[PDB]
From a paper:
The ribonuclease in these processes is the RNA exosome complex, which degrades transcripts in a 3′–5′ direction and in a processive manner. The helicase can extract mRNA from the ribosome and is expected to transfer it to the exoribonuclease core through a bridging factor, HBS1L3 (also known as SKI7), but the mechanisms of this molecular handover remain unclear. Exosome and ribosome thus work together as a single structural and functional unit in co-translational mRNA decay, coordinating their activities in a transient supercomplex.
When analysing the cryo-EM data and, in particular, a subset of 40S-containing particles, we recognized the characteristic shape of the SKI2N38 gatekeeping module in a density feature on the side of the 40S subunit. Processing of the 40S-containing subset allowed us to obtain a reconstruction showing that the ribosomal subunit binds to the helicase–ribonuclease exosome assembly through the SKI2H module ( for the 80S-bound reconstruction) and to the SKI2N38 gatekeeping module. When we superposed our reconstruction with that of a collided disome, we noticed that in a configuration in which the helicase and gatekeeping modules of SKI238 would bind to the stalled (leading) ribosome, the SKI8OUT subunit would inherently be positioned to interact with the trailing ribosome. In the active ‘open’ state of the helicase complex, the regulatory SKI2N38 gatekeeping module not only recruits the cytoplasmic exosome by binding to SKI7, but also engages the ribosome 40S subunit.
Author numbering:
A (entry chain C), D (entry chain D): 1 to 305
B (entry chain B): 631 to 1564
C (entry chain A): 1 to 122, 157 to 197
The structure:
């Protein structure tokens, strides 16, 4: 019953150090398939999967410390990255030379996330707020406030009007873009979350925590649909499939597992990635899976519909 | 044409994908707003999605879907009011929301339905059921069919059930029951060949208000006969037999029904009920399978009760039933989710709330536990209140006190009869937590008077000593702990408290006796970390500072596992005896390897050990202090020490890049890191002295880095703001003086003796710090005062030697040697500076093996002499013996080539030239060629 | 101390180069730069504070409060609950399917849709007082449910009997 | 029936801290009687028993943490030592100056054992492998791999072609040097072993565990010949006699006992060594017994043939 799964591509050494983030973006209407990775360095190398392999195209740089998170937009060709250098400089992604550069410390911005219309590029700060900047318009026009500890994750629904945020100690806050008032706060876990993502036609919110558990919550209320516990170590990143039937999770036990929401079970497990895996993402259509690990290797998988 | 697109959308609806069909129907309704079939399709789609949502436990989604379906249904009924399809669907929609959380269902129904057309109105559950009955009656009037008769009967049954459930009335539902019975009999008599009608008749007959079991059995048998594959009727008969003490035939009927349908939940629940009633061994497995199948309330409650009972019993810990059941299946989280759904559906069972609270407490979900206890309190005030309510009060108070909110916890423990040990002890703990130690002490003696279960008494004595000590007055607490020790069998907590109390004073002998007592006859404790920490603190208190490493190495050798011990070893070598920096780095790396959740502290400690070491490696990337501190920062960006280590690593990397002379990098981030340090410091409970030291070091290092990089204005503004915030402290005034004196004196300029005198007075203001003395000696040297700089260096040396430091002594020695060698290089008379050089270098060589000191000796000897062969021998030894830094070897090579060119030996000059060529150098070869062409 | 300034010659000499030392780390590791200037010492102020000392740590581990004692633990309460079961919630009832599909009509010849009429499958619209009274109007089979009742279930030898 | 036993030599304070390992080597054909000890320090002091006493000859040092294991060769004059310092530096033992220095952490090497021809120097790691280096040739040419926990003991048969290894949780693995394939795994105990030794003309394998029992296994099969239980505390080291008639075991109850394999009983017990004893070894011929304890004392005994 379990479908046939195959890698079809393994990269020997993409970078020189641990890879911390990866983003796959099918931004343009034709087959672009742009992949941007950042790995404990100034290097924000951009790869391209042309037919069956990855070919390096850009080696744009200009950072001073290790980049911790990268993200890519689906409407316009653009990219953004942040590091411990306290600088959010967004690249052009076609010629790749430093369109802008925003000053914001670890007390002002931690992770990156583009708006569904690629207009705001919200970030999270130490004091618990969620700083929202403006692309091409200005810096720090306003920020939604919640009363909590260090905030790590910022997630956007694929239709807007929602904004989730995970924080240290497990407290989860949900805001509405239309008004900006705190709707309801979810207690969540007792350990840091460090991973959130919505789904299309959003009605499900999936949380990954530091204790190994995976909670399945329901938006617009506080009802949880279940708890998935299959991993043995910390869970670091979770990405959802383009159709609401599966989602992939990567843990700290050197194992990448894919679950199914309909039956709440693990359909397959991949035994690769000899070291920790720090990022997994889907492509435009749910056929391939990318995964970058603490060890210097980039893995692409194949998941049939 | 629109009919084709509508039929396409209808087909799309049949083969699932209901959302697309709803969107298509909306698009069709866009062009024409009065098409009836599209409204009917939307209503049917909304009803089915609402029922699917009700299959799971989503009451808000279901209520919203019913409201939308009702709006669409009345919109369609506006146009065509003679169609039995719309009337029956409206009745179905009204009666569908049955047995769903009363006082949570409030639906907006608009317009004609509620008599006269008036805006929008809000109806309750009973009113909604009455409207459904009316709609069913209208459908029956327009079309008389047995199906609608049965639907009206089921609606009346639901109305009677709702009226009975809430306890609103009794014996006044007989008319409704008679109407339902008549409608169902009429329906079954219109067509007596439908198992559905027979089963419905049986179900309505067997209601507790009627209890006509003979007719129920007849109807169930008839339904079975009408169609052979009838799992529902078979399991209904099995349930009837089971409740009328018929275990065997109920088991037979449930087994046959299970065989006829393997995926039916009620038959499985019945099997579980018989197994529980007979006391079998697989009842828990049956309940778990039932809960996994379709999330029904009965299986939920059974599984919850069994798990709670198994957890409550404490003698099952190794029986292999508790182990497998509660660890291999991960029973606790599934039970927790099940209880949230059950309490959402029912929400009037205080025991269920208490079980959910107990599981959440066990799962460290204290806020949810407090909420559950609050709901149980609200439900339980109007109860018998002997055991349920007082226990609920105590548990709510304990949980509330645990999550702060001390005043409310005190009030909650006030609102209960204080005659039981649990309530008094919880009240005492909350009282102590807020402060107000005297009433807490009275309550604790009261608990001691009541106490039994002597281990508990010993713990009460330990608590009394702790709270009494918080009030000072240590002698009586010491006598209390001694009294606890004299008792027939000491407890580990009491001995640990006694040892820590002895540690608080500087006595150090009572602590040794208590540690000996703990070591003598206590072995069941399974925490090596606490005992090792206590022993290390014992050794460190007497100021030895060396036996700590021996004790921790012995502990690590005894237990090669336990990564906590490795982390402690790394931390201790970071703090005490920081000469095994390589060993500390190794211990941190090993501690990080052995596990994952210790990586933060392990990486911090190995980063600090690497920083202490410097650059004593093979110049390999990916393994420097910067990389490890970045990894630690990624793992846990909450502590201030990581940011302080980041500052130190950035400064060290800046110095290394200057030394290698390639590029400065990571220039200006000190302000952001300082702000992060302050923000992360502000959120810790209490480390007052440690926090003050952390902030002082961070601020001073940030100011120094800004001064070094060249942002003099920002540093001055920071210093002025710091001095404006609070009254003056000598360290900040010295820091401001250093900031101010950067513009003046980089380039040669004389300064008044008045400025020197205030600076000297300020340096005197904050004494016992070697850096300030070394800096003032450097300032004296820069203006030029050889004697003053030498006296200041001697003062710093004596200060460092008295305080037990070692790096400061070496630095003072080397600086004094450099100064004296510099003044001697000016070829001045009064040749006492060479004697100073010789004494300083001899002392440095006695301290350790210093290549810089031997090079200074060689340079002075080279200044004195040149004819003597020995000088050449010494220089060749320095330049040729391995294990030397590049710069010192280069300087020795340079001076040797100079001396030999003076001595005119071309073979030796060629030997030096080729030796320089094997390594990497340019200056020596450049000067070699330059003097070759004289 | 005399406080006599002592002027040193301004040019070092080209034939000889200045002596600029640098200190690396706490555990002694020096070197020599070519370029005359600051002593340029790394971590001037010492190593940073790191973790607190063991005496404070042990003071904090125990003498913070009595909350770490096992008398305020998850155990040591001896709770117990009382089991209630409810077989009757295992009864199930199904709903009859809709009796009409509302199928369209067609003009005979040159098929076109005139309207929609309700086909069977195989005044004052406010629903006032719509209850049904004066029952027992038609004859369907005249079945009797009150006199002769089944007792024997199918497949089963004898049946449980109620007075 | 029990023979006459006497100490004839007691050293007051050989070192300043606890002694963790001892090695006795009759390397040269004549009377060398070299004794090398390492004790919770940088000191790897080498003693010599000339006629009736021990005379200190070398005090070589150069370690940063406590040395945990030492070994001596019987063919060439050489010595090796490892510590928590993560450095295996082998000494000349004649002049005693740092012939070599190999980098290997506690995650790469824990204990030392010379080859019968003094050529391989196998060690054990946390991940379960057995790293084999090369004296005078190179570093880390190959390593046998087993899937287990921390490994503690490494033993060589006196004819080669065999390699035993005890580990934490009691799992015992046996390898053959000729091929390197796992022959058979013995369950043993459920707690760490920390002591193993073969016998001459090797056909017997003696195991010491942490529960006080002493198992006597037979190589080339899985048959156990018996279980010896006479000690009261942990058993730390076991050494076998040059003739297959006795073997000496040292426990944590401050007692040194000598057993006999033929009848499996304790012929004599020595009540000395007021604190724990961490090492016992035999000399070239079975006449004397050395024992080092947690207290700073060196004891030499006498066992007649």
């Amino acid at each position: 019953m379990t479908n046939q799964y195959g890698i079809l591509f393994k990269q020997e050494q993409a970078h020189d150090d641990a890879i911390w983030s990866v983003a796959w973006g099918t931004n343009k209407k034709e087959n672009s398939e742009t992949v941007v990775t950042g790995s404990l360095d100034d290097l924000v190398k951009v790869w391209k999967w042309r037919d069956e392999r990855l070919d390096l195209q850009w080696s744009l740089e200009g950072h001073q410390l290790g980049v911790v998170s990268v993200d890519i937009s689906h409407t316009l060709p653009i990219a953004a990255s942040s590091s411990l250098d306290a600088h959010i400089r967004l690249w052009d992604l076609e010629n790749g030379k430093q369109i802008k550069s925003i000053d914001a410390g670890p007390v002002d911005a931690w992770t990156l996330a583009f708006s569904p219309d690629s207009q705001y590029l919200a970030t999270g700060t130490h004091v618990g707020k969620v700083n929202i900047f403006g692309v091409e318009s200005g810096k720090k026009e306003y920020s939604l406030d919640t009363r909590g500890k260090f905030i790590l994750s910022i997630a956007y629904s694929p239709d807007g009007k929602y904004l989730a945020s995970g924080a240290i100690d497990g407290i989860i806050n949900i805001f509405d873009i239309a008004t900006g008032k705190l709707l309801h706060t979810l207690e969540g876990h007792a350990m840091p979350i460090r991973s959130l993502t919505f789904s299309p036609d959003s009605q499900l919110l999936v949380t990954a925590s530091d204790d190994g558990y995976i909670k399945i919550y329901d938006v617009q209320h506080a009802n949880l649909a279940g708890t998935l516990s299959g991993h043995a170590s910390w869970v670091l990143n979770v990405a959802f499939c383009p159709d609401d039937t599966h989602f992939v999770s990567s843990s700290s036990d050197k194992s990448v597992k894919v679950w199914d929401v309909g039956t709440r079970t693990c359909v397959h497990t991949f035994f690769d990635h000899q070291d920790q895996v720090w990022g997994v993402k889907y492509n435009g259509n749910g056929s391939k899976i990318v995964s970058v690990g603490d060890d210097q290797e980039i893995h692409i998988y194949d998941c049939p519909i | 044409s629109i009919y084709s697109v509508f039929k396409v959308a209808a087909i799309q609806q049949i083969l699932g994908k209901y959302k697309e069909a709803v969107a298509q129907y909306q698009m069709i309704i866009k062009k024409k707003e009065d098409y009836v079939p599209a409204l009917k399709g939307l209503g049917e789609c909304h009803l089915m999605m609402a029922k699917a949502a009700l299959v799971d436990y989503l009451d808000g989604k279901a209520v919203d879907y019913i409201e939308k379906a009702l709006e669409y249904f009345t919109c369609a009924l506006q146009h065509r009011a003679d169609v039995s399809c719309l009337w029956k669907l409206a009745g179905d929609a009204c009666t569908c929301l049955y047995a769903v959380a009363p006082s949570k269902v409030n639906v907006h129904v608009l317009g004609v339905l509620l008599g006269q057309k008036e805006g929008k109105q809000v109806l309750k559950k009973n009113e909604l059921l009455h409207l459904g009955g009316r709609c069913y009656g209208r459908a029956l009037k327009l079309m008389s069919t047995s199906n609608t008769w049965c639907d009206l009967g089921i609606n009346y049954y639901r109305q009677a059930q709702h009226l009975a459930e809430t306890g609103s009335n009794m014996n006044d539902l007989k008319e409704l029951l008679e109407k339902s019975l008549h409608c169902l009999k009429k329906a079954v008599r219109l067509d007596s060949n439908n198992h559905l009608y027979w089963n419905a008749l049986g179900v309505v007959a067997c209601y507790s208000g009627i209890g006509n079991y003979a007719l129920a059995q007849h109807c169930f048998i008839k339904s079975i006969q009408s169609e052979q594959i009838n799992a529902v009727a078979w399991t209904n008969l099995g349930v009837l037999y089971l409740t009328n003490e018929n275990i065997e035939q109920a088991h037979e009927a449930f087994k046959m029904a299970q065989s006829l349908d393997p995926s039916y939940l009620m038959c499985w629940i019945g099997q579980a009920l018989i197994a529980e009633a007979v006391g079998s061994y697989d009842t828990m497995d049956l309940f778990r399978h039932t809960t996994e199948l379709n999330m029904h309330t009965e299986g939920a409650l059974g599984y919850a009760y069994w798990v709670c009972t198994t957890l409550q019993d404490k003698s099952n810990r190794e029986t292999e039933l508790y182990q497998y059941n509660i660890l291999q299946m991960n029973a606790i989280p599934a039970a927790q989710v099940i209880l949230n759904k059950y309490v959402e559906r029912i929400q009037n069972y205080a025991p269920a709330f208490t079980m959910l609270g107990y599981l959440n407490e066990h799962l460290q979900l204290k806020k949810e536990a407090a909420n559950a206890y609050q709901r149980a309190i609200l439900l339980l005030q109007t109860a018998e209140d002997q055991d349920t309510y007082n226990v609920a009060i105590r548990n709510y108070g304990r949980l509330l006190c645990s999550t702060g909110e001390y005043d409310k916890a005190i009030q909650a423990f006030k609102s209960t009869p204080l005659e039981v040990l649990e309530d008094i002890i919880g009240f005492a703990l909350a009282l102590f937590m807020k402060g107000l130690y005297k009433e807490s002490s009275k309550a604790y003696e009261r608990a001691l008077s009541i106490v039994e279960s002597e281990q508990d008494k010993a713990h009460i004595l330990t608590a009394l000593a702790i709270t009494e000590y918080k009030q000072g007055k240590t002698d009586v607490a010491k006598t209390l702990l001694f009294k606890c020790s004299i008792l027939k069998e000491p407890t580990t907590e009491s001995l640990q408290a006694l040892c820590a109390l002895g540690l608080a004073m500087q006595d150090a002998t009572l602590s040794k006796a208590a540690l000996n007592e703990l070591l003598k006859h206590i072995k069941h404790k399974d925490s090596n970390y606490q005992r090792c920490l206590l022993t290390s603190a014992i050794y460190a208190l007497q100021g030895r500072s060396v036996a700590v490493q021996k004790q921790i190495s012995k502990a690590v050798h005894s237990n090669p596992g336990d990564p906590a011990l490795w982390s402690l070893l790394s931390r201790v070598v970071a703090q005490y005896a920081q000469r095994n920096a390589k060993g500390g780095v190794v211990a941190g790396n090993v501690a990080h390897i052995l596990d994952s959740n210790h990586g933060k502290k392990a990486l911090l400690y190995t980063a600090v050990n690497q920083l202490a070491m410097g650059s004593s490696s093979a110049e390999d990337e990916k393994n420097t202090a910067l990389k490890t501190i970045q990894k630690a920062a990624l793992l846990s960006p909450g502590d201030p020490a990581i940011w302080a280590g980041l500052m130190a690593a950035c400064h060290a990397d800046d110095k290394l890049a200057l030394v290698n002379n390639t590029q400065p990098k990571r220039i200006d981030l000190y302000l952001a890191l300082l702000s992060a340090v302050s923000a992360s410091i502000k959120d810790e409970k209490f480390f007052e002295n440690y926090n003050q030291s952390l902030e002082k070091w961070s601020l001073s290092q940030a100011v120094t880095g800004l001064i070094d990089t060249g942002r003099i204005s920002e540093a001055e503004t920071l210093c002025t703001k710091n001095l404006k915030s609070n009254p003056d402290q000598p360290a900040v005034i010295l820091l401001l003086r250093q900031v101010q004196c950067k513009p003046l004196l980089e380039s040669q300029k004389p300064l008044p003796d008045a400025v020197l005198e205030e600076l000297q007075k300020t340096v005197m203001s904050n004494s016992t710090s070697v850096p300030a003395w070394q800096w003032l000696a450097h300032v004296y040297q820069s203006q030029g005062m050889m004697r003053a700089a030498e006296m200041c260096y001697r003062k710093s040396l004596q200060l460092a030697s008295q305080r037990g430091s070692w790096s400061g002594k070496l630095s003072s020695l080397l600086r004094l040697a450099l100064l004296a060698l510099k003044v001697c290089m000016a070829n001045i008379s009064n040749d006492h500076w060479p004697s100073l050089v010789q004494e300083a270098t001899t002392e440095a060589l006695k301290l350790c093996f210093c290549p810089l000191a031997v090079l200074l000796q060689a340079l002075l000897q080279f200044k004195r002499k040149m004819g003597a062969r020995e000088t050449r021998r010494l220089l060749e030894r320095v330049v040729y013996q391995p294990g030397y830094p590049k710069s010192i070897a280069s300087t020795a090579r340079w001076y040797l080539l100079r001396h030999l060119y003076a001595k005119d030996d071309y073979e030796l000059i060629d030997v030096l030239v080729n030796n320089a060529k094997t390594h990497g150098d340019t200056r020596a070869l450049e000067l070699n060629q330059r003097l070759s062409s004289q | 101390m005399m406080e006599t300034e002592r002027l040193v010659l301004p040019p070092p000499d080209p034939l000889d180069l200045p002596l600029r030392a640098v200190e690396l780390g706490c555990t002694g590791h020096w070197e020599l730069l070519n370029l005359p200037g600051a002593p340029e010492s790394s971590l001037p102020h010492g190593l940073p504070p790191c973790a607190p000392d063991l005496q404070q740590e042990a003071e904090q581990l125990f003498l913070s409060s009595p909350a770490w004692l096992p008398l305020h633990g998850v155990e040591h309460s001896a709770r117990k609950w009382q089991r209630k079961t409810d077989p009757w919630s295992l009864l199930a009832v199904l709903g009859a399917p809709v009796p009409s599909d509302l199928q369209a009509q067609r003009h005979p010849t040159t098929g076109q849709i005139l309207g929609y009429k309700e086909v069977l499958l195989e005044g004052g619209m406010d629903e006032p007082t719509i209850t049904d009274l004066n029952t027992r109007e038609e004859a369907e089979e005249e079945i009797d449910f009150e006199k002769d009742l089944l007792t024997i279930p199918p497949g089963f030898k004898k049946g449980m009997d109620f007075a």
